[PDB]
């Protein structure tokens, strides 16, 4: 081997994607293209007429109706529906992954105990291979390749393009004037959308923190559910921030006006839309300092709230150029890398510190350094676990109590300036939380059995308790058809047949208790699976609504709660063949009444 130059080593160095203008321009364009490829404005605007009719046909009580004819309500619906669909897809994948681990619990246990010296990245690949994961890559390139259409994060500026803003009617109460008023949104809503970008974490990224310390398969499943309980709680808060009538701050980085080669500083301020806490990172030479601050209770004078975790002294009064960026990682993930980078500041160079941080925050790119990667995932587990330095439940509850107080204040302020009718236009009371509001989730089907396409919808888990209704809308080319709905539980399924088109037909009524569980046919279930079979389908939509507006919320389940009670989801993979159904098979039938396989025909 000849002597090695430094040419190859400079190429693989991390780059500052935020500070560099060319790199930021390129990632904004790709993010826009990915959003436009999956969700098209022209298709969404065309679909508005059908959705407005479907929501009206749900026959909700007065004061709980959703009127998509109002511009503000339509805007909030498409942001919520896109957000909910991405979160819904992630839970379905996590449920699938849980089943694979439970099937191979003998071999998964062997990996967890025997192999501990190897890093999180290698252990994750070993676990994903031993199961039939259908997504066996933990690298960022593999994760991007194996991504669906609904997973793609919501791009806020694309949703807000072309909407009329600032319709003014002066002392006019007439019906014609009001109708024009409903057709536009205020400036505040436009600014909220321009600073909105959702973040959704794949199960493959979550497996690395979960397996870094766990020694048993049950240990691993509990960690996975604990993380996703926190993630889904933050998604609900993010949607609530757009409904309170207040603008949302945007993350920015401060850099010196005229940077010096040997004396340069970078200050990063992260304001995640999904979450209750923010992070401020300062890089002065080789010194890294951070301060975690609350995003609630902020006055108008100061953008930052009370700081809850300290990691040094960070100066937010530094003067320099401001660059706006959108974070693609959660507050927990950003803090995990920040606390790991502080430990390895001496070993790493100045450029590596800046490059590794900027790539993770703006591109969700794990650092190449194996030692740095391992330490970050250990901190990620700590912040999720019960021994976290941050009381996440306390901060999440205060954010909820701060947001609805803002809604009351902003609604009352507008009731004085203009009428109550105008206030209802711009601050709708129906929209509270991503899981509280009545929403629809379009279903995509890739499996066809005897000419019947299968559409899968996961019912639960529920962060709210009360009475909840589920409805299904079927659009088919044929003039007359029969479609079948199957609701799978731990023991048995339902097999409803409806044969109605273009109108929502209610399929399932549930009551959910304060712990989040429901009694489905005599057993406590935390979640159910619904499969809709339909011939020659065009579009299938599932509608979800609560009986009471602003339903009470179930406390978030931490790690101890998940391992306390175990539910079997292995039955969710079963299927029926509607072409071979007879009349006697319809209705509630338990598993004992079937043979091995043939879950559609009962034994004679």
């Amino acid at each position: 081997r000849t002597v090695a130059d430094g040419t190859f080593n400079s190429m693989i160095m991390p780059r500052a994607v935020i500070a560099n203008e060319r790199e930021h321009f390129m990632k904004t364009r790709i993010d826009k293209i990915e959003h436009d490829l999956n969700r098209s404005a022209k298709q969404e605007m065309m679909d508005r007429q059908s959705l407005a009719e479907d929501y009206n046909a749900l026959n909700l009580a007065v004061g709980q109706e959703i009127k998509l004819d109002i511009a503000t309500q339509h805007q909030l619906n498409r942001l919520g529906s896109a957000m909910y669909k991405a979160d819904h897809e992630r839970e379905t994948e996590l449920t699938d992954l849980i089943n694979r681990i439970r099937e191979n619990e003998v071999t998964v246990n062997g990996i967890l105990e025997n192999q501990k010296a190897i890093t999180a990245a290698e252990r994750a690949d070993l676990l994903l291979e031993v199961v039939a994961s259908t997504a066996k890559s933990v690298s960022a390139a593999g994760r991007a390749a194996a991504d669906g259409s609904g997973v793609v994060p919501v791009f806020g500026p694309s949703v807000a393009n072309g909407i009329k803003v600032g319709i003014d009617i002066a002392d006019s109460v007439a019906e014609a004037a009001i109708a024009v008023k409903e057709s536009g949104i205020i400036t505040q809503l436009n600014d909220v959308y321009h600073a909105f970008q959702s973040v959704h974490v794949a199960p493959n990224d979550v497996i690395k923190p979960a397996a870094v310390v766990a020694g048993t398969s049950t240990e691993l499943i509990g960690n996975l559910q604990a993380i996703y309980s926190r993630l889904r709680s933050h998604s609900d808060i993010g949607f609530k921030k757009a409904t309170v009538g207040d603008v949302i701050p945007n993350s920015y980085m401060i850099k010196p006006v005229n940077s010096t080669e040997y004396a340069s500083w970078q200050l990063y301020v992260i304001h995640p839309v999904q979450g209750s806490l923010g992070l401020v990172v300062q890089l002065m030479g080789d010194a890294l300092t951070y301060n975690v601050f609350a995003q609630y209770g902020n006055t108008s004078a100061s953008e930052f709230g009370k700081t809850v975790l300290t990691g040094g002294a960070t100066n937010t009064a530094l003067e320099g150029t401001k660059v706006k960026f959108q974070t693609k990682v959660t507050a927990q993930q950003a803090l995990a890398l920040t606390m790991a980078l502080k430990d390895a500041a001496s070993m790493l160079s100045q450029g590596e510190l800046i490059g590794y941080f900027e790539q993770y925050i703006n591109l969700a790119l794990e650092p190449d350094n194996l030692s740095l990667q391992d330490n970050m995932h250990k901190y990620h587990h700590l912040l999720t676990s019960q021994n976290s330095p941050i009381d996440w439940n306390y901060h999440d509850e205060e954010m909820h109590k701060w947001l609805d107080s803002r809604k009351t204040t902003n609604y009352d302020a507008m009731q004085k300036k203009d009428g109550t009718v105008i206030a209802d236009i711009h601050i709708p009371k129906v929209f509270n939380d991503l899981r509280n509001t009545t929403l629809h989730c379009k279903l995509e089907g890739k499996q066809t059995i005897a000419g019947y396409t299968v559409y899968e919808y996961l019912i639960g888990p529920w962060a709210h308790y009360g009475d909840i209704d589920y409805s299904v809308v079927v659009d088919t080319l044929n003039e007359e058809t029969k479609w079948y709905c199957e609701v799978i539980g731990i023991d048995g399924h339902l097999l409803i047949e409806k044969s109605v088109q273009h109108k929502p037909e209610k399929i399932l009524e549930l009551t959910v208790n304060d712990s989040g569980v429901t009694s489905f046919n005599g057993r406590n279930h935390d979640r159910l699976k619904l499969k809709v079979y339909v011939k020659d389908s065009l579009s299938v939509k599932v509608f979800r609504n609560w009986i009471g507006i602003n339903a009470p919320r179930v406390k978030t389940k931490m790690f101890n709660d998940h391992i306390g009670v175990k539910y079997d989801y292995s039955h969710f993979d079963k299927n029926i063949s509607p072409a071979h159904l007879t009349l006697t098979d319809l209705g509630w039938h338990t598993w004992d009444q079937y043979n091995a396989g043939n879950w559609t025909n009962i034994k004679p």
Binding site: V3, E261, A263
Partner: protein, 233 residues
């Protein structure tokens, strides 16, 4: 051994004027640095002694073919006594003096892109003593003033406060500063009689100890052996 014996800035600069770049480059293939190794120190311990290899050890190590490697080889010779293996540099460059490389533009070498922080980290400045650090800062100042980077050298010193306290008090290009300098830069000198023929635990300490003990013998016998080969050249 000659370079480590100089104890004043004006002696050190005079030595670099007469010393070609060839003496700062080794022809021994050596080993790759920054390697965690176990060495045998039987005077103290029965077990193997953990240590890490570095460029500023007294032993020649493999070097890179870039300009960064050549500057690191020069500094290692000044602070440790041995250079590094950089093959086929060139006959013309190897004939030039070390001071010519550091302080003159006629050599044909470009050093504007050098990062002083990176070079210090590669040389393990954290493990260097006060005398070694002062010698390294002398080489940085000479390189900085050649390239017009006087401001960068000052800013680099501000970031590293401990290096600022021991910074040499000489301005390149001014003869008055060199004349009145009162720095002490002697790594190796005539030993105090208290020194014994005993090993040291670290790689750096033992190699430095070897140079110290062999200085008395080198001082008496170097002149005749040098002249026996120098005459009739």
């Amino acid at each position: 051994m000659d370079v480590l014996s100089k104890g004043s800035l004006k002696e050190l600069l005079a030595h670099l004027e007469k010393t070609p770049l060839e003496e700062a480059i080794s022809y021994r293939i050596g080993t790759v640095p920054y390697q965690n190794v176990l060495i045998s120190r039987n005077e103290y311990y029965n077990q193997l002694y953990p240590d890490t290899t570095s460029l500023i050890d007294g032993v020649s190590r493999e070097g890179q073919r870039n300009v960064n490697g050549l500057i690191m080889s020069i500094i290692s010779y000044v602070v440790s006594g041995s250079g590094h293996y950089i093959p086929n540099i060139g006959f013309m460059l190897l004939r030039r003096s070390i001071l010519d490389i550091l302080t003159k533009h006629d050599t044909g070498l470009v050093t504007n892109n050098l990062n002083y922080g990176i070079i210090a980290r590669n040389l393990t400045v954290s493990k260097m003593n006060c005398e070694q650090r002062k010698r390294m800062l002398i080489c940085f100042k000479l390189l900085a003033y050649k390239d017009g980077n006087q401001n960068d050298y000052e800013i680099y010193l501000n970031q590293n406060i401990p290096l600022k306290q021991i910074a040499p008090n000489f301005i390149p290009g001014d003869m008055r500063t060199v004349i009145h300098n009162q720095d002490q830069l002697a790594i190796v000198g005539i030993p105090a009689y208290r020194l014994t023929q005993s090993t040291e635990l670290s790689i750096r300490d033992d190699n430095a100890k070897s140079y110290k003990l062999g200085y008395v013998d080198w001082y008496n016998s170097n002149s005749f052996l040098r002249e026996r080969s120098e005459f009739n050249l």
